[PDB]
Amino acid sequence: PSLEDLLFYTIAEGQEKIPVHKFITALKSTGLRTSDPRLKECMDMLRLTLQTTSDGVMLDKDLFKKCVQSNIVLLTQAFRRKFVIPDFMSFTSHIDELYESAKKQSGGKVADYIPQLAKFSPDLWGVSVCTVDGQRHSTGDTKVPFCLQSCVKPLKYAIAVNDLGTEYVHRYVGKEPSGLRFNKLFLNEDDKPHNPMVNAGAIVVTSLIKQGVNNAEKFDYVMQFLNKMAGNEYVGFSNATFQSERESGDRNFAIGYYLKEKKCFPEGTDMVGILDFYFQLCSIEVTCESASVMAATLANGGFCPITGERVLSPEAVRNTLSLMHSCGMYDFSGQFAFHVGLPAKSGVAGGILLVVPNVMGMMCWSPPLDKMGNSVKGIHFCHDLVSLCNFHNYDNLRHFAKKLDPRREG
């Protein structure tokens, strides 16, 4: 027997003749994109053999094999419906329905406390799925860059725990939701910020990453770390957003001075520089598609699903997912934990970094915020998503009433 032949005869019409477009169409049907990095050798070989002629354009058993052999394990998985969502084409059809149902929710207000945020049309709206196996789907304005803003707080927290461990990091920042009556003050009883997802805790977390090197290096390191997380999809930087976040961060300066007086930073911290580094991190740019891969790294235990690279240690990913469960949607965190039951993080640009652990990462993005600061359409989509599929964290994987389970072929 032979692994590449057995797959060949499957894609074949039971015949000696596989058009190349047919193989590409059959591959996309699994949800993988031809640009998938773990498929490069195969796609390289297809480019080679499609240069060989122009009156081709078709693969023998051994020429087909000549392309796929380097990537055969991944390709057989895709075609033998081994992926976490076997019938992904039906799943994207539901994601499209949900997208159009949230698209009709044109409420909310675009953040206008800085020009870069207020310029954004209230009509932009995108949703991008990337499963733990790299299957990709997008509806809407998914390639438009926007700033992460607070959506960066879990990513940097995970960096910090990845490099330093849980015990050190939580010498400086708590582990618990603050919660709603006291969503205003800065420090819990132990004089630490309540958790990494509030501004004070985010600011403290910023002060732990790559201590010793300067802010130009530190930002470089976070970018490289973020690139690993997105499988080298789009990550960028809005200097405009940086400058206006910087020129109007009085509450952030208040927090930094308060944390300094309270001795909240590690020894040898330059607080005013950390605020600058914090403003930079908030201005990092992503798209729906590329942020969805970062979310899929978190859904996948710290392995980037479209490169296979270990990016975050599993301690880091669990801690971060834990804190996004209870602290990730501002004052809506408890409501969201209760009704959506998914680790998520929103940001003022309108992003919601959403994680279905073991299944998929998602990024939703619609600039109009509700009065708690969360994207209206993003919040609506998250609710529908879990009304549809047994993705709620305490849904039962066996008895789940009439919710749909996309992990099953039935």
Ligand X SMILES: O=C(Cc1ccccc1)Nc1nnc(O[C@H]2CCN(c3nnc(NC(=O)Cc4ccccc4)s3)C2)s1
Which residue spans within 305-350 are E strands per DSSP? 344-346
DSSP 392: S
For the bound state, the minimum distance from the C-beta of residue 81 to a second copy, rounded and expressed in Å, comes to 17
Extract the annotated binding site for substrate: 150, 199, 245, 252, 278, 330, 348
**Binding site: which residues?**
150, 199, 245, 252, 278, 330, 348
Judged by beta carbon, residue 180 or residue 216, the one nearer a second copy is 180
Q: Which of 129, 329, 337, 379 binds a second copy (CB under 8 A)?
A: 337
Nearest approach, Cβ of 127 to a second copy (angstroms)? 15
Which of ligand X, a second copy, none binds 318 (CB below 5-8 Å, type-dependent)?
Answer: a second copy
Q: Interface mask (CB under 8 A) for a second copy, residues 143-182, using x and -?
A: ----------------------xxxx--x---xxxxxxxx
- The C-alpha atoms of residue 345 and residue 202 are separated, in whole angstroms, by 13
β-strand 136-140 against 368-369: which pairing, if any? unpaired
Answer yes or no: are the C-beta atoms of 329 and 374 closer than 8 Å: yes
Q: From a second copy, ligand X, none, which one binds at residue 351 (CB under 5 to 8 Å depending on kind)?
A: none
> What is the pattern of x (binds a second copy, CB under 8 A) and - over residues 112-131?
----------xx--------
The residue among 187 and 298 lying less far from ligand X, judged by its C-beta, is 187
Closest CB to ligand X among 198 and 340?
A: 198
Strand partners of residue 138: 128
Per-residue tokens: 150: 């607070």
Closer Cβ to a second copy, 58 or 388, answer by number: 388
Closest to 187 in 3D by CA, of 276, 277, 258, 266: 258
Nearer to ligand X, 39 or 197 (CB): 197
**Across-strand partners of 237?**
284
191 binds ligand X (CB under 6 A): yes
237 counts as binding a second copy under rule CB under 8 A: no
Site for a second copy contains 184 (CB under 8 A)? no
User: Which helix (H) or strand (E) element contains residue 358?
Assistant: none
Q: Which of 323, 348, 379, 382 contacts a second copy by CB under 8 A? A: 323
- Which positions ≥6 away from 354 have C-beta within 8 Å? 295, 342, 343, 344, 361, 362, 363, 364, 382
Which ranges of 135-238 does DSSP label H, i.e. alpha helix? 152-164, 166-169, 199-206, 215-229
Task: Tell me which residues in 282-321 interact with a second copy (CB under 8 A).
Answer: 299-303, 310, 313-315, 317-319, 321
* Contact status, residue 8 vs residue 65, Cβ threshold 8 Å: yes
Residue 334 within binding range of a second copy, rule CB under 8 A: yes
Q: How far apart are the first and last CA of the chain?
A: 31
Distance of CA 238 to the CA centre of its chain: 19
Map the footprint of ligand X across residues 171-190, applying CB under 6 A. Answer: 184-187, 189
Q: How far is CA 400 from the centre of its chain?
A: 26
Q: Burial of 132 by CB count in 10 Å (0-12 exposed, 13-18 middle, 19+ buried)?
A: buried
Pick the closest to residue 365 from 377, 380, 383 (CA basis): 377
Q: Are 83 and 77 in contact (CB under 8 A)?
A: yes
187 binds, among a second copy, ligand X, none (CB under 5 to 8 A by kind): ligand X
Residue type, 144: V
Applying CB under 8 A, the site for a second copy has a residue count of 61
Site for ligand X in 366-395 (CB under 6 A): none
Are 128 and 137 a contacting pair, CB within 8 Å?
yes
Minimum Å gap between C-beta 255 and ligand X is 8
Is the CB of 38 or the CB of 318 nearer to a second copy?
Answer: 318
Q: How do strand 360-365 and strand 126-131 relate by DSSP bridges? A: antiparallel
Q: Which residues bind a second copy (CB under 8 A)?
A: 100-101, 103-104, 106-107, 122-123, 132, 165-168, 171, 175-182, 188-189, 299-303, 310, 313-315, 317-319, 321-323, 325-326, 334-335, 337-338, 341, 343, 357-358, 387, 392-402
Q: Which residues bind ligand X (CB under 6 A)?
A: 184-187, 189, 191
